[PDB]
């Protein structure tokens, strides 16, 4: 136990969310909302990811539900959540993955079957935003529910801070080359909506669109008109780096912007960020047990006012530890 | 023009029979229909294939339908064949990729939508199922619907005439280090029937079920039960091998044995089969211009009675040059 | 601390017997023969592996050489082993990776500089050969040198005792769908010697040969002459499966062969094997902390005399942990 | 025949060279240097590349040399270019792929193992360097040898000429989501020089160093420190795409840039540059038959002095193809 959790989508970002809610905070019993996985699929499912390693401690089909690691779990079918229930299990604060559920109206919607605070893990036009990082005294009980800006989002918005905070930044964009989403195909193929031209996989060097600006601006205004993005999704399947460029207010020192963040690192933020003087270490971080992670060395250059800046990502995971971090933040707050 | 062709799925296999249909035989004129490919796509679709290549001449769109070649084709979505219209265009010869759509039962619906005769791509509970390599007289007029051998059931028919006829054969088990499906996954997750895992993609070197047992025995009476099958799914977008492990009644010597299919490739086969002394060329076939494809060296190794042989695939494709080489026999008859 | 060991080719299998040696059995201090890798990086290559996860502990550069987790490591430069020393540390038994060393003439070479009993990773067509399943009293002090049969061919071995001790085989063959090795190139090229056509990677599903036979009956004579094989290395970079096909002298059932296996892994083997009746788990294995492990279900089908089965591998590691098994059964024992 | 080529390293950047300075220009008759590559490989290597596809025609091996579609073409091994003689076929302009050989001191070597002129396939410390992008006058007889600039560096000199010279570009960063190297290594291990982690292959996306900046610079004088970068190399074998942020003098709109190069695409430079408002093809281009290839669409985002930009490659080949553009023109003058 610890708060008291329940979640929408067991899959891929379901899972650390119901994996780490259990591990990292613990943080209560819960729930499973999860038409089109099974009783019994949620047991192997969950434990077994080949992106993350197995689970561990016993992870088993009991009595009407789930026993991870003893603590009962159930599973709820419904598709269409004010049609499931939440009720049961006194499931206050659940978190949803989906896919389509994204909004007030929406996410809103939930709390006719029980609900009472929801956090979302994805963007939204319509609602509160937030993420870790910049989150302060933002969150007020005021409120209802809750999101948890984008991988790419997410990871940017601890840039900002350190940076914009300490050396001016006017005019600023950037790319990520990401790992492999639940959305990039097999071979070739139709797609979807913003197409993303659903025709690789394992094949291309895939060209996209995030809003890293409208995204990282919500969460520091300031920045919020000043920032703009695309990303290249490729073949890796989990982790991915973010880079920046800036343009800056005050004068930069590659050596300068490195200690900046080691600093500030250092001190409020601990939780993401980082500072690996270390030394191309590619792709590892796969959970490192990190949010957002930079480094020095990368593909730095200096120059005053401009200067290039690269921090990282280990979405799947990193994410779903943010959303725990930001569900005790809420709920001990509200 | 040629033959007078509709199709069923735009999509993988769809693209080639169409590709093919026209470069191959061309058998004549068309119609297309593809809930979900919209006029336009089935431009850039079937145009552009990352695993082929990408389509040349042209491929545009301009009254009412695309412009093949010049060659007017339609587009009709229809989601249910009976919906679709189908005489229009007046294409008593329609091949269905699809997925579900097998059986007599739905494949004769079609039929009703409009239709005369139809061949599935892919093989079929009930139903007439033929396959070029052993097809024969087998195929008559009481024919209104047939089918064309799995990708890699259509594959083995081929190996098995030459070596059953020629040399005894008792008790035969295979593999099929196969390439990449519509139904393979990236990342981990919820799967279906037969499972299949929807467990990888990229990462493993995933474990599978294949009906090469029933399927060759039809095609081959004779072997019939002589046979039975699996095969593991690789990262491998297009084309895949066939192992074959036999024991036989005449006693053979390797060097007999790929001696077989050379003199007899050469002489009924042709179109089918191969005979690559040439020297383990890893994968690349890939639309070679073959069905399947056999070779010395491999993982050849003899002994009298006990030996394993090894073929080919080039499945995606191959497969779509045997279906207008079945749509080329079946019109001509009937 | 524990044995008193060495190792050649701080590289991948390298690395897990450096690796293993310490945290599995320990056993004592050692030093690392390694030219082409220095005092650095030991440090890093051996800590973070891409396939396995990173280290811990503290892997670093103090005095002389390299404290891993304190217990003091050396590094040793020479190329050519008679040259190196090996005499310092006292490193009584020395396993070495390499690729060219292997044969009595050379592993025997390097007692020059002080070694004592030799282990190797790898046959040889000259030498004591051995692996943990079948070894027995086998090994004898007589010996100055033994090797641990190949990826390949340890992971054989246990099935072969258990299936021909129980059921006959009598002609039995069989191929391997295996990971990435070393020598497997990026792009296109050039090879070498069993040329291994070295022209893929990523790309193609590859042919190739391995001593199945040789090695599996050098270790159960009886087999020995009734087995043989052929493997196609595919892109997964770690972990495989092998593939056997049997006619056998006593009837099997497919549920006893299985149970078989289950009784007999249950007590002696325990260490090399498994027998998951689990269910596709496709590739996970990955250092699963076992050998060669089988399951139930997979590619198996039944008849009196012929059958067909199915083990697996996670070479790099098992591996390099039977190698640490048999360095204990050759010191204790000598 | 044609001009009068030999060439070294038949390898990757080799078979191009050969392959098309054929198809496209010919330039005659030739000869081949390559220590490690006898006579026979010479057919399959260049012949067959997993990559682009096979070759075609014939490739063959009659008297003393390879019958490359019979234009009689030679092979020489030799391991020094001193060594190896060269008059022998009397080819006065050999192009250098190699690794190593960068730089007059032994490029110029050559010239007295045989030779006259030479073009260097890769950068250079010291010596002329040049692209056709910028190419023009700047090419003269004084010249005896020459370069043709990076895969990457010649891909950039296109886009940077039609955007310098037409609008401002005050500072201006890149990164380059590479295809992967003939130094990409699989598994993890040593590595050498720039280190580049030779960690890696399919699993991580790998950050590393590029000189675009005095590359371009040299290239397009103007430019040559409003420049630097680095790129990402990741599992994708053939063709790479580059990101170039600038901040510019006169003010741009994202609909005028991609019309610049539109307009000024069609004109002086056509076999350079491209202008696809097509949309975002992955990564077909290999072998497309184009130098750097741009487009509108993409990542791009605009603001008065403040914009990102995004070209292309096809790499390995477009490369291949400027060499012989390059040959061509060099021959001519001199
Ligand atoms: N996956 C990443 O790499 C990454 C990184 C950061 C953020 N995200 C965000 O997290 C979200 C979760 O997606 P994922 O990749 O973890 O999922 P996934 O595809 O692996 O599994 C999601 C499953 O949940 C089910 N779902 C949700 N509610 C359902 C209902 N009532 N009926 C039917 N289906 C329902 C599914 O739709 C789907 O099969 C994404 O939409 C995105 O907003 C993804
Ligand atoms: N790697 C696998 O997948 C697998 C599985 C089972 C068995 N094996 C066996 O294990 C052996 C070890 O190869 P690996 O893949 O672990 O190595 P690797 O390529 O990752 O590293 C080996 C390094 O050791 C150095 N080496 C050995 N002695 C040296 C000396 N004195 N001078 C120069 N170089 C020397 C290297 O050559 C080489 O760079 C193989 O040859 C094979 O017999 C491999
Ligand atoms: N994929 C391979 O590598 C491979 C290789 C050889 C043979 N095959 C064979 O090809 C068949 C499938 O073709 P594919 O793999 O190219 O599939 P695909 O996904 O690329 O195309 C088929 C799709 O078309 C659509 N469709 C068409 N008409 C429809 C209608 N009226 N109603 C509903 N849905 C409709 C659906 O989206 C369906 O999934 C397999 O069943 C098998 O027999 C596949
Ligand atoms: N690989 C790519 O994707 C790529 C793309 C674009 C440009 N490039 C450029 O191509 C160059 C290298 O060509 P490649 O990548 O095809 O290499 P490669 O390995 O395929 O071929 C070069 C090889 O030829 C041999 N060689 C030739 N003559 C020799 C001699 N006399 N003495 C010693 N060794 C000799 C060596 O084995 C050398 O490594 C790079 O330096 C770069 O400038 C590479």
């Not at 109206?105 to 029980?114: F, S």
Request: hydrophobic share 40%; aromatic share 8%; with cysteine.
């Amino acid at each position: 136990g610890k708060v008291k959790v329940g979640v929408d989508g067991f899959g891929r970002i379901g899972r650390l969310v119901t994996r780490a809610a259990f591990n990292s905070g613990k943080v209560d019993i819960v729930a499973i909302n999860d038409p089109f996985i099974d009783l019994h699929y949620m047991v192997y499912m969950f434990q077994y990811d080949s992106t993350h390693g197995k689970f561990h401690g016993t992870v088993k089909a009991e009595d009407g539900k789930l026993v991870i690691d003893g603590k009962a779990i159930t599973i709820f079918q419904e598709r269409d959540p004010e049609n499931i229930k939440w009720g049961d299990a006194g499931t206050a604060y659940v978190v949803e993955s989906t896919g389509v559920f994204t909004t007030m109206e929406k996410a809103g919607a939930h709390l006719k079957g029980g609900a009472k605070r929801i956090v979302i893990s994805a963007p939204s036009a319509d609602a509160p935003m937030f993420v870790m990082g910049v989150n302060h005294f933002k969150y007020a009980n005021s409120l209802k529910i809750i999101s948890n800006a984008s991988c790419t989002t997410n990871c940017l918005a601890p840039l900002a801070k350190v940076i914009h905070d300490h050396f001016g930044i006017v005019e600023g964009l950037m790319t990520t080359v990401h790992a492999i989403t639940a959305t990039q195909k097999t071979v070739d193929s139709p797609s979807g909506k913003l197409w993303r031209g659903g025709r690789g996989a394992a094949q291309n060097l895939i060209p996209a669109s995030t809003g890293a600006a409208k995204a990282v601006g919500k969460v520091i205004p300031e920045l919020d008109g000043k920032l703009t993005g695309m990303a290249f999704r490729v073949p890796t399947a989990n982790v991915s780096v973010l880079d920046l460029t800036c343009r800056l207010e005050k004068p930069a020192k590659y050596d300068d912007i490195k200690k900046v963040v080691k600093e500030a690192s250092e001190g409020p933020l601990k939780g993401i960020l980082g500072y690996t003087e270390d030394e191309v270490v590619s792709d590892d971080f796969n959970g490192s047990n990190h949010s957002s992670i930079f480094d020095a060395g990368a593909g730095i250059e200096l120059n005053d006012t401009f200067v290039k800046l690269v921090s990282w990502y280990d979405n799947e995971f990193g994410y779903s530890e943010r959303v725990v971090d930001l569900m005790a933040h809420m709920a001990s707050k509200e």
